[PDB]
Amino acid sequence: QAALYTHHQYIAGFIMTGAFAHGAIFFIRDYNPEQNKDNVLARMLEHKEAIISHLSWASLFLGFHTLGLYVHND
């Protein structure tokens, strides 16, 4: 059971990294702004700074507070 769980979880993580890498490759090599004009993909590209900044905030908040609670308990 332990081996199966660890196996499929690591496989899933690698697969997710691959999915995001191929999304990046799509944007570089296959994304045409002419045909994708003001659709959902173009709107993601438009407010990407907001997305990245809010991900940064969520990561910072989680890391700070979880690490602080752990160090407090230690």
């Binding site: 700074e49 907001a50 990245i52 900044s53 809010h54 940064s56 905030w57 230690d74």
Partner: protein
């Protein structure tokens, strides 16, 4: 002509430049356009060569900075003596040194940290110190806290004096360049007047203060009724009843009947059985002899009275057929470049500190030092790390000299030019020897791992298997064990109990020193040490020799000493600068010193340190498993890293819990360093751009534009955090383990 030359009031004492941060450089004096400026302000503050091209001003800055460092060290020492005077159990430890743990630091009761005030003994609670200051003060003859107080007050006075001296020699009377370039006078004064006279003075202290007080202490006299040192100096009959030769009173010294001083100027060797340290009579004779030697040696160079040596003429006269002009032009190098002197002195100081580390455990010079295993381990590890850092710094400053201070016109067909001209052969052969050593040591460890895992213990490299005996080291030990018999007939004992003879010194119920045996494991670990040292030397020497140019970038001198790269061309020029070579040599020195200290710790806990019973049975801290477990990497993982780390991780809820906390925190800092080491700069710059957008949306973006750390700064931060985490992890682990098992 050697004369005193100064300039009056060169720099006005004013706070005007305190308000201007980057005043020392033209680039930083404009202002902080970006955040990088702040970091640059701290990275160019002490690079005096970069501030100006004037060597006189650089020399003045260096002199005053040295005065400031001396003041800082005086403050630090005064603090140690103060904490010994008030927040210490020094007198209780004097009454019973074998059962009271030294402690000189007491925490405040604020957040439960008061648990750190452990029961060290003598009716005292505090942090158990491992600096060896208690034993040093015992050797010096200090018996009361009043003496520590007066020493601390004198230390504060000397710190103020050094601070004033720095101010005076920068702002009021600044020496000229001719004064600094008098290297012959400087050597004569630092040999005769600094080392020789200092050794003579310390011999005087020992003769008049340390020997009588310490021999009364060895006799069992309570320190309270031990007469004060000035009573020994004044009432010389009181001193003569301990050593009768004092009744002669300087007559033997001037009649050359020096043998009459054999009472307190001995050449015994070995250890004092009562304290486990060196005999202080031997130490006094040692210091007197080296004082005489240094005072003689300091009369070698010609300053202005004729009679002496011109070092320029000595150097120019040493050349041969295999070299060109030999040591021609090196006098100008070493009298006009501060970085060359810094490189030489750093290398020598690091090697000297390593010698100190090796020699202070084999001959413990202080009473009750060997049996204090925590102090021994701490001193060894501390001085090993200091020496390694200094050696790497010597490499760094040799590279800096090669980049900036090197002048090809005045260096033609000399030794430096010829070394530059066959650097390819040097680095080729050093690379080959590094590969050969790595294979025939670590591959031997891997062979042992594999045969142990395959169930073939007879195919391993051990004492019960194919044996690799260190016959040369064993022969050297045998020779040193028999030195008093034939080779040094005026010696009672050998140089150290580690050579041989079957003698075991056991202060209290512990073991001070005993003959250290060498076998296959010692062969393997010494060859591992050689491998690590040669690889570090390879990295550093390749950085120094190829700092100016290489087949890849023929104009690397124009790029500078501290630059990230030259671009992604030629396949990629990442880390081509000598600074990056120092950056990697820091990692390799870290590995070398780490393995050295691990070997020391395991060997001592396994074969030397232990407890002896009344019958005479000697049991060791680990149990003598180094000979059979150090041959295998799994043995290192299990019997050393896993077995001996049981105490740092179980230290919670006790006075050693701080060691576990810092163990984990150092692990954290190391892991944190990993991302500065692995990541780049564009990624973080773009993340910073997104964060800056977030701030601009709310009109809170700073005018000082946030920038990611430079590439070189990224590497510097990574290596700094890496070394801090690793070294602090080991520090916590050793201290917890050795306080628990000792």
């Amino acid at each position: 002509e050697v004369k005193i030359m100064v300039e009056k009031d060169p720099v006005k004492t004013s706070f005007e430049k305190w308000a201007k941060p980057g005043h020392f450089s033209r680039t930083l004096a404009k202002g902080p356009n970006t955040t990088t400026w702040i970091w640059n302000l701290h990275a160019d503050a002490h690079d005096f060569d970069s501030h100006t091209n004037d060597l006189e001003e650089i020399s003045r800055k260096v002199f005053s900075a040295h005065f400031g460092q001396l003041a800082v060290i005086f403050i630090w020492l005064s603090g140690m003596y103060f904490h010994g005077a008030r927040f210490s159990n020094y007198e209780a430890w004097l009454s019973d040194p074998t059962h009271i743990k030294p402690s000189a630091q007491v925490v405040w009761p604020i957040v439960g940290q008061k648990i750190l005030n452990g029961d060290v003994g003598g009716g005292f609670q505090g942090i158990q110190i491992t600096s060896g200051f208690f034993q040093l003060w015992r050797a010096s003859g200090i018996t009361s806290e009043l003496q520590l107080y007066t020493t601390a007050i004198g230390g504060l006075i000397f710190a103020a004096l050094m601070l004033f001296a720095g101010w005076f020699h920068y702002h009021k009377a600044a020496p000229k360049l001719a004064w600094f370039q008098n290297v012959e006078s400087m050597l004569n004064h630092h040999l005769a007047g600094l080392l020789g006279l200092g050794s003579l003075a310390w011999a005087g202290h020992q003769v008049h203060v340390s020997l009588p007080i310490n021999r009364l202490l060895d006799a069992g006299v309570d320190p309270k009724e031990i007469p004060l040192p000035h009573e020994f100096i004044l009432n010389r009959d009181l001193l003569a009843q301990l050593y009768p030769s004092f009744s002669k009173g300087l007559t033997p010294f001037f009649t050359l009947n020096w043998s009459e001083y054999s009472d307190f100027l001995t050449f015994r060797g070995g250890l004092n059985p009562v304290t486990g340290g060196l005999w202080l009579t031997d130490t006094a004779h040692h210091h007197l002899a080296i004082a005489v030697l240094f005072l003689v040696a300091g009369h070698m160079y010609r300053t202005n009275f004729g009679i002496g040596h011109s070092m320029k003429e000595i150097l120019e006269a040493h050349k041969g057929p295999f070299t060109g002009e030999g040591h021609k032009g090196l006098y100008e190098i070493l009298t006009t470049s501060w970085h060359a002197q810094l490189a030489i002195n750093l290398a020598m100081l690091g090697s000297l500190t390593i010698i100190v580390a090796h020699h202070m455990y084999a001959m413990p010079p202080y009473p009750y030092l060997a049996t204090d295993y925590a102090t021994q381990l701490s001193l060894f590890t501390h001085h090993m790390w200091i020496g390694g850092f200094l050696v790497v710094g010597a490499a760094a400053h040799a590279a800096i000299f090669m980049v900036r201070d090197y002048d090809p016109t005045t260096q033609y067909n000399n030794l430096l030019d010829r070394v530059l001209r066959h650097r390819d052969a040097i680095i080729s052969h050093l690379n080959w020897v590094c590969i050969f050593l790595g294979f025939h040591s670590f591959g031997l460890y891997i062979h042992n791992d594999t045969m142990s895992a395959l169930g073939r213990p007879q195919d391993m490299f051990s004492d019960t298997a194919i044996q690799l005996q260190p016959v040369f080291a064993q022969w050297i030990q045998n020779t040193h064990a028999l030195a008093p018999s034939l080779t040094a007939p005026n010696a009672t004992a050998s140089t150290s109990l580690t050579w041989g003879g079957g003698d075991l010194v056991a202060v209290g119920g512990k073991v001070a020193l005993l003959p250290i045996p060498l076998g296959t494991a010692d062969f393997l670990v010494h060859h591992i040490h050689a491998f690590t040292i040669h690889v570090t030397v390879l990295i550093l020497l390749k950085g120094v020799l190829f700092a100016r140019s290489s087949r890849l970038i023929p104009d690397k001198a124009n790029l500078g000493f501290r630059f990230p790269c030259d671009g992604p061309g030629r396949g990629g020029t990442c880390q081509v600068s000598a600074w990056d070579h120092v950056f990697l040599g820091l990692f390799w020195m870290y590995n070398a010193i780490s393995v050295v200290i691990f070997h020391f710790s395991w060997k001592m806990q396994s074969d030397v340190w232990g407890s002896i019973s009344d019958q005479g049975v000697v049991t060791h801290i680990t149990g003598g498993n180094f000979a059979q477990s150090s041959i295998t990497i799994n043995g290192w993982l299990r019997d050393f890293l896993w077995a001996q780390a049981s105490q740092v991780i179980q230290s919670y809820g006790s006075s050693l819990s701080a060691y576990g906390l810092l163990f984990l925190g150092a692990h954290f800092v190391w892991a944190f360093s990993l991302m500065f080491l692995f990541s780049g700069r564009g990624y973080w710059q773009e993340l910073i751009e997104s964060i800056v957008w977030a701030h601009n949306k709310l009109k809170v973006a700073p005018a000082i534009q946030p920038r990611a750390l430079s590439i070189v700064q990224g590497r510097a931060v990574g290596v700094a955090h890496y070394l801090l985490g690793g070294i602090a992890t080991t520090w916590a682990f050793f201290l917890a383990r050795i306080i628990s098992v000792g």
